[PDB]
Design an enzyme around this catalytic site. Sequence first.
Site, short mmCIF file in Angstrom:
data_model
loop_
_atom_site.label_atom_id
_atom_site.label_comp_id
_atom_site.label_asym_id
_atom_site.label_seq_id
_atom_site.Cartn_x
_atom_site.Cartn_y
_atom_site.Cartn_z
N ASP C 48 0.84 -1.19 0.00
CA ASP C 48 0.00 0.00 0.00
C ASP C 48 0.88 1.24 0.00
O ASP C 48 1.76 1.38 0.85
CB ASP C 48 -0.92 0.00 1.22
CG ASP C 48 -1.98 1.10 1.16
OD1 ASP C 48 -2.06 1.80 0.13
OD2 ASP C 48 -2.72 1.26 2.15
N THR C 81 -3.98 7.79 -4.25
CA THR C 81 -2.81 8.33 -3.57
C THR C 81 -1.53 7.99 -4.31
O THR C 81 -0.61 8.81 -4.40
CB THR C 81 -2.74 7.80 -2.14
OG1 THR C 81 -2.62 6.37 -2.16
CG2 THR C 81 -4.00 8.18 -1.36
N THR C 82 -1.44 6.77 -4.85
CA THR C 82 -0.23 6.35 -5.56
C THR C 82 -0.10 7.06 -6.90
O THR C 82 1.03 7.31 -7.36
CB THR C 82 -0.24 4.84 -5.75
OG1 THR C 82 -0.20 4.19 -4.47
CG2 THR C 82 0.95 4.39 -6.58
N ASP C 353 -13.51 2.41 2.81
CA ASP C 353 -13.12 2.85 1.48
C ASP C 353 -14.22 2.59 0.46
O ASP C 353 -14.32 3.31 -0.54
CB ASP C 353 -11.82 2.15 1.05
CG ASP C 353 -12.00 0.65 0.87
OD1 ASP C 353 -11.59 -0.10 1.78
OD2 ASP C 353 -12.53 0.23 -0.17
#
Lengths: 106, 521, 486, 523
Positions: C48, C81-82, C353
């Site tokens: 993650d 986010t990545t 999520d």
Amino acid sequence: LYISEGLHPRIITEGFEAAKEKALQFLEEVKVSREMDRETLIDVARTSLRTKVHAELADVLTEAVVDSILAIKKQDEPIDLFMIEIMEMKHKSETDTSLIRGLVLD
Amino acid sequence: TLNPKAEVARAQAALAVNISAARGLQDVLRTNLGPKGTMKMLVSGAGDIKLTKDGNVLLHEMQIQHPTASLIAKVATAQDDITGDGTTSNVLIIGELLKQADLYISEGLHPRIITEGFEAAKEKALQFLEEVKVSREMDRETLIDVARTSLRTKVHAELADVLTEAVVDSILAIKKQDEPIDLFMIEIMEMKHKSETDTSLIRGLVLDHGARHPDMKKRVEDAYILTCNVSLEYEKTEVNSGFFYKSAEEREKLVKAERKFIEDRVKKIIELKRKVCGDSDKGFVVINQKGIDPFSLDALSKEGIVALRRAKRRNMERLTLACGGVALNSFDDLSPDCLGHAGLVYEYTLGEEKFTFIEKCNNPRSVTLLIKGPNKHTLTQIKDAVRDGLRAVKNAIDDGCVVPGAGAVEVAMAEALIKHKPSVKGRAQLGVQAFADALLIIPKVLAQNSGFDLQETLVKIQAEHSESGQLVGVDLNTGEPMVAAEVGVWDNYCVKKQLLHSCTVIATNILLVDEIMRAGM
Amino acid sequence: KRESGRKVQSGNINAAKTIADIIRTCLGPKSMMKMLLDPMGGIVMTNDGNAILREIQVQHPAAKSMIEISRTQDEEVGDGTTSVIILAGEMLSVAEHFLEQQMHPTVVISAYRKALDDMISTLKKISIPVDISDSDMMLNIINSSITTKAISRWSSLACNIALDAVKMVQFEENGRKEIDIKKYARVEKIPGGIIEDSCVLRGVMINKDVTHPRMRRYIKNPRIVLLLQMEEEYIQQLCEDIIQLKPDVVITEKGISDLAQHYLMRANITAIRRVRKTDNNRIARACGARIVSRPEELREDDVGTGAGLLEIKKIGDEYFTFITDCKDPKACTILLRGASKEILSEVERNLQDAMQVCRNVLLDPQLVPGGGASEMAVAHALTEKSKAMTGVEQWPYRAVAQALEVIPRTLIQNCGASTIRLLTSLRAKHTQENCETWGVNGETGTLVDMKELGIWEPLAVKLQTYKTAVETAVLLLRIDDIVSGH
Amino acid sequence: KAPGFAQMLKEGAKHFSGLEEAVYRNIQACKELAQTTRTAYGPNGMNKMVINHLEKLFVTNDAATILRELEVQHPAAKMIVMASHMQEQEVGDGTNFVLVFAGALLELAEELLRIGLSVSEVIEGYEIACRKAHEILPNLVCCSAKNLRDIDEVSSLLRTSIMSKQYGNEVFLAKLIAQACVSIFPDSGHFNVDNIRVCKILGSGISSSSVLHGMVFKKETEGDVTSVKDAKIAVYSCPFDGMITETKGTVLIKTAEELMNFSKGEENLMDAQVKAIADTGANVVVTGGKVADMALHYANKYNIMLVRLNSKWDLRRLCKTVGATALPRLTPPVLEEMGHCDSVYLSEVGDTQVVVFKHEKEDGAISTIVLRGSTDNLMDDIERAVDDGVNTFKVLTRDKRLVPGGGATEIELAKQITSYGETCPGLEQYAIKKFAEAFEAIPRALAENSGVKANEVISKLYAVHQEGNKNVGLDIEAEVPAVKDMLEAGILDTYLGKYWAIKLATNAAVTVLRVDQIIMAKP
């Protein structure tokens, strides 16, 4: 890979001698014994010349390399490449290669 | 391009580090595979010594320098809790899987492609077990070969025949009515002052502290066992009063006054003794857990009563099921309902200590496996073997199907996977080949530990083929091929099933590690 | 001491690029793992992007800004986010213009801001509407996150939890469609049971336990109150006005000591204590109660009339107080059941999520083609738009387009296929064929249309992703002097 | 810089590579353990100048004392040392048999592993040869104890065990220990070394020693009473000195007269304390520490026999025989915790008065050997011979079977095992033959310690055994390397001593061979 597992070299070499004979017998089956014609030798000369040139002198040297051989063999005579002389000259581009039926003198 | 106090291997060196750790851990545990395998020592630093071939103890109790190898050590803790065996061979397949993967990764192959080949071979490998699993009905001879197959890998081939019949009968004593087998029904007791081969079964429980008085019966053929938890020793004032004294003599009067709290109840034991079949040809036993004064031990012994003291909570629960008497938390409410029944209750005498035995119970639904050995480490060694032998028979009965051993499944699954093409992509063919050659490490290692050539043994068992379903394995004594069914060498179905699912998951995840970053190490 | 000049911008690029190079391979379903060596030898092979950078301690200030922005992105949006860090790093990795060509940052920032307005304009053209009224259509979108999870056993229950819980919080009457999962959809773990017993409660829950039996077990009309000798008399009077109203449960903000609990127990009501101010505001809206200054000023109107019922039923070795109703009082509560705390923790973060996905899709029913299709589609528009871009800004304007190719680049690298061969053929498909499709297959590695494969992502996730990556790249380029000072 | 250490991943422990022969290193640790005791083997054993942990000098040749003082830290050596400790159980001799024999098995195993033979096949040969040795050892039994309880018989067989611990003085010690052992053998099925105690006294020499019944204590009777037949014996650990009160008991004294008043009050109290001893029907008292001057006269007042036992082991020796346990208070009249004895009297032997606890009324199955010596180190070394000598006949209470000594059995047992390996086909013959050569190390030890070419002893011992002259051992002599018959000379070993020694030595050697890597750990 196998010697690191404790196998002796002499055992592996005996396998190569066996694989060679099997591989040598299979080569007899794959070979094509067709008649050698100008269409076939061009494929051989192109396959041999492509590995030494820039794919531009292929058609240039192919027809010269093939015709040079056909001029020195007929009636199943033994062949000798020393019959063909190889000359070199400057002042011309690389693609100016051609044949000379006769001979060049200095 | 980096920050201070930070380091990261961006290239494929992270795999070369993790692959090197598995190869190192492979070379360590491969020497203790099978009965012919060597043993490993476990020095605790303080001077204690412990020898064991069980891979879980060599990974759970031992400490490992490499951080990557500690991950695989935790896997053995998971493999042990589910099946109880296969922790050593699980580490060998991971090392050989990663070894074969490194051979293809050096050729420019992506790791994710290799993991897809393992998932395809694993699903085919599991189906091969369903075809070769023998659903033989559980009997004495079948479980002897299974328990022998497990116990021989943890002993010197001398305690195998001794421990085999004991471990087999321990499960059969608790196995009935198609009930799920519970290992809590078998308690393991150790004893010094005897050799190692004196291990045998006890039909009933065994207690540490016994009767200590000359006037006690050395053996009680029958008795109404009374379960109790009340201390018959000097206790505090249980009434609305206290202790107030003026001298050592006035203090002694409080002891005489306080001892009356027990003296009225010690005679209560004599009352229920005479009450419930107090005539001739009868007996009475007390298993009160708490402490007992020597007066009460001296008083009741004159009436012919075996009274015990200072027992454990778990033993008292087992004692109630063996006898039937419910625990009385206060002697004031005594009745026959708190009594049980049992057979021969004798005392086993050692060189120094003595132990209580309650054999010949009616319906205990529980037994005890009495271990005897001369050394301390030898007791822990045999205990770890019996726990592994018990789970081996448990898995054989809980899962009635068994499979062959001696690497016969690995040699067979290797040939099966080679004769199986992919269905998702062509490059997965390489991962299937790595899975095939990885399973052969087990028959390879068994030839090394037995002192035979690695290549000659595998080529013989792998070349052996016929026009019928035929098994073939490694003969540890001769090195020639061996049909495992014709000799009594059997493994469990859940062990091989969990092995393929465990090795594929960890060898996969280790190959997906692209970088190793220090989190402030 | 102090660093200024081109050394600053060249350093911020190497920092943000280094942080991006770490998590390049953690993108997509083939997310490669990362081995983090703890100082004590501990190792975690997580994949993650958030947890990786969360534990990695960095020293460069620019790298911290790149990390803190992704953290803020994680709260507002549960995904992307990545991609923010990879794009922000790739947008900054084009240093050909900053140093070799000596382009001022104000020239590039004019190009990056111009591309951002055009990148947003290109996404909305390739968008596609959604029939959110269909539960199966929206279920096909939430399955993208449920895959490879423990909730996949009862994924239909997992979607119905988040989908209705968001819609209950969805206040569409005000137009903006404000949604707040943390405020109006409080989640609490309940020991015992299984994932199948997970349901929604139409109201507020109180996790306090029952200490004494003198309490209301079942009431039809919950009257929810909201607000040694000297201690007895001062407590004897404050408790007198409360019991005078004949309440059913008293929820005071501050503590209720033993003597105060004594007089309350004489009235046979549930003693609740240690609750926050906003929680009292949520309690009041659950039943229509009134918060008062002190117990002295309590009036007859301080009642929770209209609520469903009060219940202190013990569920799994724990008492739970409910003030729920059979209506929708602007909130809800997810009662997550599970036979163990190991399974309860996974379902909590998993469904959290999942609510963020439905939050973004329902805020605007417009998706976009994932799998690199949106990136390659947007890049084709800028490359064509740059042909009419008269000026020196055309060179960095086109570089931003090629920087978006990193998303299909990493997805192809993880699959193990040839990156140049597929990315070359991929760019040609967007030229001739429609740009709304012809993305990348993250599982197979070959090209595939996004109409045949439901990898459709929301629109708000990509807009805030490109907007945050460009604004982050514009931020660090504007940094030209890193100086100390307290 | 790579390539670093190979096969090193567990706490950086010294893991020997495949070329470094990790198994060869654990064997070298065991060979060094043998050389420390190979020289002390036999009657001509070399003494060891041992330095105790208290920086005390002791010159001895006992194996158990060498290893107890030599801190053996290598685990591979601890296993053989644990076999020596297990050798002490079921027999009190043959310790160096375990060290010398096991060291030869491991030393000879290296010759097999170097050839290429697997360690698992070496173990199978030693296990087969150990089983074969146990079948041949009964056939070597030459004589057996008649069990006549004759001192002429017990002393004759005991000479072999006394030698190699205290050589030269084997005549006196054999007669004394025979007199002590013969007096308990009538107690059928209860003989133990705990009964035959030892009491060392500083004296002229070993020749001045004798045997006396009962628990003898060297400290003479401090009191003036010569004899007392009282059963109640009151043992106290606290010495006779100025009393202290367990409560506050604050004693304030200012003037000189008050000092004399409190001093008189203490003497009147101590007179009452010793009065309480006689009130409880006990005319005997024991003391650990000092004894006061006034309390001494109080012991003579009521004719209470005063006893002093400064050694702690002497006190605990009485606690387990008579029952009198030591209490923390000074003279508490606790009659319940007192002892019981049939007779207590003083006796002068060798010009020294010693306290005696004789059992006149009771049958009596306890004795004590009172040793005399001009050096404490000498008497301690002689005490070790008593334990190894008495324990030799504790074994003869079991099956009485004696075998020849002096290396005689080691050659015949090797000769019989070597023939079994020659006719046994397969790979096990290599380890079976080396098992026979391991026995040859014991005659080689006796020959080397006597100053003789060991190879000449083996050559002669095999020739006489080839002709069938069994019971032939090494003739202990400096100027005569020939051999003689052990039967005619009277040298005989115990059967169970060789049985349990060959068994435990093989298990220790096999247990070391089964180990291939030493790994550290942490809890």
